[PDB]
């Protein structure tokens with residue numbers, strides 16, 4: 001269920017991050033960051049992605065240093081880094 005403080009695909013911060021809510025429609029494949037292959041890359045397994053951030057819902061969690069807002073686990077951004085990679 002979408003929080004009010006959802007990071008929208010079209011968020012200004014999202015744009016800066018080249019975030020997508022749905023990683024299967026991210027440029028992640030083009031970016032092909034190291035860690036794991038692009039299709040496995042999403043906020044779900046992003047290095048400093050936090051469940052602990054409060055406000056976090058069903059699909060929605062705290063990204064790294066994305067204050068106030070919550071990203072969708074299924075999403076991705078240019079900063080994506082594996083949990084220990």
Ligand code: SF4
Pocket residue numbers: 017019042043044046047048049062063064066071075076077078079080081
């Ligand atoms: S840094 Fe990670 S958790 Fe945050 S938006 Fe990017 S991929 Fe998602």
